[PDB]
Every structure is written in C-alpha cells, then in structure tokens.
Amino acid sequence: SPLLCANSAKNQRLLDEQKMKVLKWTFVTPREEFTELLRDQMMTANVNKALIANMFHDDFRYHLKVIEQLSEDLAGNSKALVCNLDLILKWLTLRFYDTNPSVLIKGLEYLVQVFQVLIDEEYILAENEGSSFVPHLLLKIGDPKDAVRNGVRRVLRQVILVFPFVKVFGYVMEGLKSKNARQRTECLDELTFLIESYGMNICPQSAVREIARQISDRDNSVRNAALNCIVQVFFLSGEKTYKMIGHLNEKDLSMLDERIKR
C-alpha cells in the first residue's frame, strides 16, 4: 500500500471547496473541524491508512516519522506527491501551529525537496494550494528560532517561482498587522527582498504607504526594517517616494534621509 496514491481526486477536492461543500482552508487558529475535514479527504484519497493514523496523532514524534517517510517516498513517487500536494500542504499548515521546533525544521526541509520537484516538473500551484498554504507558512517567518526563519524564507522563495509573486507580496504585506514585532520585522525584510527582486511592479503606492507607517514603530528592529525597505523603494522610484510614503514624523525624515544617504 503506497503512502500516497496517484489519482485525480484533487479535482473533486478543488471543486468541493469552490462549490462550498467543504470548509475553505483558512483560519486564525485551526480547530477540530479542519482536522476532521483533512482526515476525511485523505481517507477518500486512499492515503495509506497507517500514515493517516500517524498524521493525526497528538505526539509530535509521529509527525517527525510522517515527514521522514514522505521525504524518503518523494524520489520514487513524485507523481503521487503532486496528485496529493494539496493534502500534504494542508497537513503541514496544521504542524505550523504546533510548538515543536524539530517538526518545523524537518517539515520545512521536506518542503524544500517538494518545491524543487514542483519547479523541476514545471508544476503551477492551484489557486487553492497557494491560498491554503502561504499565509500559514508566513506565520513562522518571525519564529524565535533561526533555523525555522531560514527554512520559511527558503520555502517562500521557492513558492514565488510556482505561484503568483504579486499574491505572495500581498500575503507578506498582511504580516505588518501582526502584534508580534519579530513578525513585523521579518515581513518588512521580505518585502525589501521582493521589491529588489521584482522591482516596483510588485509594490503599489498603497503598500509603500503601509510600509512607511512602520517607521514610527517603538520596536527598534521594526523601525530599522521599515527604513531599509523605504530606502530600497527610494532607489527605484526617486523623489516620487516622498509623495508615496504619506506624511511622516520629521524625526523619521531625518532617519530616512540619513539612511537614504550612507
């Protein structure tokens, strides 16, 4: 019984969601209705039933096992992975809310192997796969742990190769609303990377406004990140930036300009 079955069941899952027959995979915190839906869908998809059992075990050590098994299975059976990609991405989004660093690091490593396969096979993420996955992944970009943050960034920078970079930009932008200052800081740095990489086509005037608001943040790391980001906008946009940043604390302007230069 292979771990994952190459079938076309993803079509019905995508239709189910579009037609409102199952919950859209979106939430602040995942509760049991999402766990039951995912387990139902994996059942229906002929995912190995022992794997399913391990997937929804409470003990994180069975999650590490699941990831190890999927990682080994990926070389020989990439077709099956792709056929079940949406289920696997969903299962990892649940693991993003668990507090175990080992599970995050190993899940992120696996994801790097997965997205490399998608890139190599020229697979294009369904709208639903991207939407179900990226907001939850981005939640970890501000993790306390260095290896988690690096893993999230590595995966995120693969996602943009197989999913619209304008949509990813949008999801990163949402991170500015976090109550967590490290989340705001890391999302700001990511915006800077994306703007340097894609140019101002990816960054409308309204986003610039939004980014500039973060300069007045009390947390010094958020302030320094927003400044670096507006500076990068300045290098691509020139004095028109000053019309885009809205209207700022003249202390900011001093900090902005003294970073704009030097």
Query: Resolution of the deposited coordinates, in angstroms?
Result: 2.0
Please check whether residue 27 is in contact with residue 38, taking contact to mean a CB–CB distance below 8 angstroms.
no
Q: Is 246 left (phi over 0), alpha (psi -120 to 50) or beta?
A: left
Note the Cα 147 to chain centre separation in Å: 15
Spatial CA neighbour of 108 closest among 61, 67, 162, 165: 67
Fold category of 1-262 in CATH: Leucine-rich Repeat Variant (1.25.10)
3-state secondary structure of 172: helix
Dihedral, 167, 168, 169, 172 alpha carbons, nearest 10: 130
217-256 burial, b at 16+ Cβ within 10 Å, e below that, comes to beeeebbbbbbebbbbbbeebeeebbebbeebeeebeebb
